[PDB]
Amino acid sequence: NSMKNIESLFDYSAGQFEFIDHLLTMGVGVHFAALIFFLVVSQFVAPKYRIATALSCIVMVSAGLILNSQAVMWTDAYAYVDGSYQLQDLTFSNGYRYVNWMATIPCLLLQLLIVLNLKGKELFSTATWLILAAWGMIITGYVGQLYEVDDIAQLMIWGAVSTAFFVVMNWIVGTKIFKNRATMLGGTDSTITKVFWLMMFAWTLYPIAYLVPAFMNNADGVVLRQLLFTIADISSKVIYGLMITYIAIQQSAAAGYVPAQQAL
Template identity: 40%
Template sequence: MNIENMLTYDPVQWQLVAHILILGFASMAAGFVYFMTTMREVAPRYRIASVLGGIVMVSAFLLLFAQWQSWQTTFTFQNGEFVRSEGVFSNGFRYLNWLIDVPMLLLQLVVILGLGAATSRRLGIIFVGSGVAMILLGYVGQFYEVTNLTALWAWGGISTVFYIILLYYVWVEIGRALPRMPASAAATMKSIRWLFLIAWTIYPLAYIMPAILPTADGVVLRQAIYTVADITSKVIYGVLVTKVAMDLSKAEGWITTSAEKEVEMVSIN
């Protein structure tokens, strides 16, 4: 059981968590609209990145909306504070959501790196394999955050090994791709590399929060970290990926050609 269920909350703490979760799923809804409306602005070879971004947004929206509903039903207001009633609030569902989202996010990166088919397959296997192992090990570890902090740290540590492997390949492959890209796309790819490092690294801070701050304030902080990390690593990351796809499409002449065709169609009509 997650530590959230073991504590009581004053009205401000409880509302902060509720509002943080609302911010999360509202951001995913906005991201979905953006990816769907900008899909036609990139060349067909990069359009799958927008599709993958849309899948991530739907998946994350459903999870965060369900978490918000769970937060509403798990606690009841008694004697000036919120206490657990009959429900159970679980962060374990986040890991199941990440099993969907992490492969999609990493494959978005593969799409815009401009690699050959064989290299893309190899890198995709490394990315997805490392990402799934990282998530599954963290999923096991979070079950021990109340009963066995040693196990929490141990499973988290093993999970981090796979994250380091993943981070290494992301950093190296982006670096290799930069010389092949136009200046505008390369600049955005550098931002993606740093965003990946920062946003994905703060997830472990939320994971270990029960060990370093096992209080109601710690719960608020953990949900804030998870949500900020989700928005940054999914929505903002996806927007940057789309920007790279647009720049690459423009450099390849696709957007200009399409615009000219639209002008010709209007002239004919």
């Protein structure tokens, strides 16, 4: 699975290799630091919204474990030899991120629907269509990147199919947001609209990283891709969760939850 990604094609300078290692290890710290924050403020969230901050804790740990796994895989697969880090064993691939996404994306979408105050039949219904659309996106994306070394054309076609799911997914999300933001309390009807645009921006970096093999097929393309993943993860998981948490607390406060009012 590692021979199919471009990381296996190149030697890396100390500077490139340590920059990638430092990017992944920093990602671990950030996520686990935000995990403590999400855990602490959960007591300031009304029971109605408390599951949202819990889902952020699930995302933080899910991401932190795969980023930590990826950093160690990175240092195991390569060895500094003759002035460059060269592939030693085949134990590093990007496929594990696509596993992180399969798991984190349903959680990220669920926390959004919860603060939108959807409930019951509509919650279960809307969540099912989003998670299926999203899994189709991720799965077709994972098939495509198996060809980023061998068959770029296939990468593209699987990229096109994956993007179809992405567009439909965002159309559902946007439609539910704009049709339900009047139900939101404390002025969060204004904040949720920004969350949506944060989503659009953060999530669009992933397909850009996905296409790096096609327009920068070299060792700096590998560094660049990890940098895009790092900006994307922090924005779609950390900042977004903070955005979701702030909305949860605000609506809790507007709903008469005392611990939420005292915290604010």
